[PDB]
Design a protein around this ligand. Structure first.
Ligand SMILES: CC(C)(C)n1[nH+]c(-c2ccc(Cl)cc2)c2c(N)ncnc21
Length: 256
């Protein structure tokens, strides 16, 4: 439709990350606009399911969600062209020297921005399924935007993140907006700790056992009670008893 553009009009300058699925490049749309280019390495999938991500983005357009600009799907290397996010993924950023020197003020803001984009997705009636700091991107103005809608659904190459996935989603395959709320609470842990792996020292297997036994991550050092209460809320066993992303955005804006 109005998303196909001729290869010509895209210049790939510098590589930003290799996957076992493709590359991400910083580039230019006809010299004027800085863009990111998601490369598909052929044979890996699914020159379609690679595009499922882009197809989903055509519908999901909010300011705190990475914006699609265009696609190139006619020659053998397929591209997804999006808004370029200068500071990379939220995970990477929080771990960098610069990220290590941002105080809670901005961390809570990061957190609340993500809660905002998620409040759009709930409203829109979608689920992300793969919500975590590595799937949040940061621009120059320190804006957080949600990316990677590979697993996003309206109700395969895939691999949902065990340590981020709600217990009823693991055990009964039950993915809902409320399961995303669980994932968000884990993303709060990620933010607070400056990009530490959840459940340090535990394998996916362990975690999960331990979840079936009512285990929660104990309150972490350098995390205020009120914040941990928000985390604890997102982890309520009963999915129905977890907050909405609107309540999260409200409660998060109220730290001052
Ligand atoms: C992995 C990393 C951090 C280098 N990365 N990944 C993407 C990205 C590109 C296209 C889509 Cl469809 C989704 C995400 C990205 C981006 N846009 N801007 C800056 N860094 C990006």
């Amino acid at each position: 439709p109005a998303w196909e553009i001729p290869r010509e009009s895209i210049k790939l300058v510098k590589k930003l990350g290799a996957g076992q699925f493709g590359e991400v490049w910083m580039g230019y749309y006809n010299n004027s606009t800085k863009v990111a280019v998601k490369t598909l390495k052929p044979g890996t999938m699914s020159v379609q399911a690679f595009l499922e991500e882009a197809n989903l983005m055509k519908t999901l357009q909010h300011d705190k969600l990475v914006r699609l600009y265009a696609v190139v799907t006619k020659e053998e290397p397929i591209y997804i062209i999006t808004e370029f996010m200068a500071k990379g993924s939220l995970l990477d950023f929080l771990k960098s020297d610069e990220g290590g020197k941002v105080l809670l003020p901005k961390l809570i803001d990061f957190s609340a921005q993500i809660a905002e984009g998620m409040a759009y997705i709930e409203r829109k009636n979608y689920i992300h399924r793969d919500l975590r700091a590595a799937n949040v991107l940061v621009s120059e103005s320190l804006m957080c935007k949600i990316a990677d809608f590979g697993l996003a659904r309206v109700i395969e190459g895939a691999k949902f993140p065990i340590k981020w996935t709600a217990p009823e989603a693991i055990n009964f395959g039950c993915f809902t907006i409320k399961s995303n709320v669980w994932s968000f609470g884990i993303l709060l842990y990620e933010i607070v700790t400056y990009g530490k792996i959840p459940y340090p020292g535990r394998t996916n297997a362990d975690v999960m056992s331990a979840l079936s036994q009512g285990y929660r991550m104990p309150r972490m050092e350098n995390c205020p009670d009120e914040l941990y209460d928000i985390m604890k809320m997102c982890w309520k066993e009963k999915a129905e008893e977890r907050p909405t992303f609107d309540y999260l955005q409200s409660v998060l804006d109220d730290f001052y």
